[PDB]
């Protein structure tokens, strides 16, 4: 009876196995744009993905991950609110059963159709496993998806999903350029938070881009054909794999823009 997104194992149940679910810096949160504070101390955000090396795409049950070779400084995030260098390890998405929901962060309570998370770890901690045990261990770039025009750079991801329909399946996925998933503007909000899936560790500097990317109805429809279950198990569509907004508590959200 492990955690998931269903009626009896979903987000309101997670605290029983993971008490930090009710902690002081949990994610996601609602971003109240009018209460967010423009911060002049914020240095420019640096996304250097030119030598990114994707390896594989995997259905882990709760989402699919595109994983990268993070054994060298090849795809890094720096600047913004960050001190030091954070290395890209994987990206994944959260999405809804309907276009009206799916994102984890919300903006003035608005839910987007999906949310992309590019996960990076602080190189001063040597690897991801050690990084998640640190309060500044990860930097996650969050990007909202709305339904409209297709995102051409997403299409290679959507076309391989038929090969990883069920939990446990993986496929080779080399030479994918995550620059094709970024919006024009790097304007962002930032705040200290957590992983949004168990173990919910409070190790994340969140950087959430203001500008969503547009993806087509057909593209998100393909996300919804995935399965939470493994092959040969009862079919349950991988939809609504999002945690809702958590209390902001003693935190301020900062904006990079005015």
Whichever of 99 and 104 has its CB closer to Zn ion, that residue is 104
β-sheet bridge partners, residue 192: 205
CA-based max dimension of the chain = 54
Considering only residues 147 to 176 of the shown chain, the ones binding Zn ion according to CB under 5 A are none
Question: Shortest approach of Zn ion to residue 206 CB, angstroms?
Answer: 10
Cα dist. 235→59, 91, 140, 161, 229 in Å?
14, 25, 31, 16, 6
Question: Shortest approach of Zn ion to residue 114 CB, angstroms?
Answer: 11
Whichever of 37 and 205 has its CB closer to Zn ion, that residue is 205
Question: Shortest approach of Zn ion to residue 107 CB, angstroms?
Answer: 17
Distance between CA atoms of residues 177 and 99, nearest Å: 26
Question: Shortest approach of Zn ion to residue 66 CB, angstroms?
Answer: 12
Whichever of 94 and 210 has its CB closer to Zn ion, that residue is 94
Segment contacting Zn ion (CB under 5 A): 18-26, 47-55, 114-122, 145-153? Answer: 114-122
Question: Shortest approach of Zn ion to residue 176 CB, angstroms?
Answer: 18
Whichever of 77 and 258 has its CB closer to Zn ion, that residue is 77
Whichever of 38 and 65 has its CB closer to Zn ion, that residue is 65
Tokens of 56: 């594989």
Question: Shortest approach of Zn ion to residue 118 CB, angstroms?
Answer: 9
| Strand duo 86-95 + 114-122: pairing | antiparallel
Segment contacting Zn ion (CB under 5 A): 110-118, 128-136, 171-179, 221-229? Answer: 110-118
Cα dist. 118→25, 87, 92, 185 in Å?
19, 10, 7, 16
Whichever of 39 and 128 has its CB closer to Zn ion, that residue is 128
Question: Shortest approach of Zn ion to residue 258 CB, angstroms?
Answer: 28
Give the residue, chosen from 78, 87, 111, 117, that forms a contact with Zn ion under the rule CB under 5 A. 117
Segment contacting Zn ion (CB under 5 A): 14-22, 109-117, 208-216, 223-231? Answer: 109-117
Whichever of 41 and 122 has its CB closer to Zn ion, that residue is 122
What is the phi/psi pair of residue 208, to 5°? Answer: -110, 120
Segment contacting Zn ion (CB under 5 A): 116-124, 172-180, 227-235, 244-252? Answer: 116-124
Q: What DSSP string runs through 182-240?
A: --S---EEEEEE--SSTT--S-EEEEEESSPEEE-HHHHHHHTT-BSSPTTSPP-B---
Tokens of 132: 């998640």
CB-CB contact of 74 with 49 (8 Å): no
Binding site for Zn ion (CB under 5 A): 117
């Amino acid at each position: 009876h492990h955690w998931g997104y269903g009626k009896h194992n979903g987000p309101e149940h997670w605290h029983k196995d993971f008490p930090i679910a009710k902690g002081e810096r949990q994610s996601p949160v609602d971003i109240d744009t009018h209460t967010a504070k423009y911060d002049p101390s914020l240095k420019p955000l640096s996304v250097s993905y030119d030598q990114a090396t994707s390896l594989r795409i995997l259905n882990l049950g709760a989402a699919f991950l595109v994983e990268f070779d993070d054994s060298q400084d090849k795809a890094v995030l720096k600047g913004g609110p960050l001190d030091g260098t954070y290395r890209l390890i994987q990206f994944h998405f959260h999405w809804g059963s309907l276009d009206g929901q799916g994102s984890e962060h919300t903006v003035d309570k608005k839910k987007y159709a999906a949310e992309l998370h590019l996960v990076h770890w602080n190189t001063k901690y040597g690897d991801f496993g050690k990084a998640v045990q640190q309060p500044d261990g990860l930097a996650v770039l969050g990007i909202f998806l709305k339904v409209g025009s297709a995102k051409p750079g997403l299409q290679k991801v959507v076309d391989v999903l038929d090969s990883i329909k069920t939990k446990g399946k993986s496929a080779d996925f080399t030479n994918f350029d995550p620059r094709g998933l970024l919006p024009e503007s790097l304007d962002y909000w930032t705040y200290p938070g957590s992983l949004t899936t168990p173990p919910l560790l409070e190790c994340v500097t969140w950087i959430v881009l203001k500008e969503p990317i547009s993806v087509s109805s057909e593209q998100v429809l393909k996300f919804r054909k995935l399965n939470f279950n493994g092959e040969g198990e009862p079919e349950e569509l991988m939809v609504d794999n999002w945690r809702p907004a958590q209390p902001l508590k003693n935190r301020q959200i900062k904006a990079s823009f005015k």
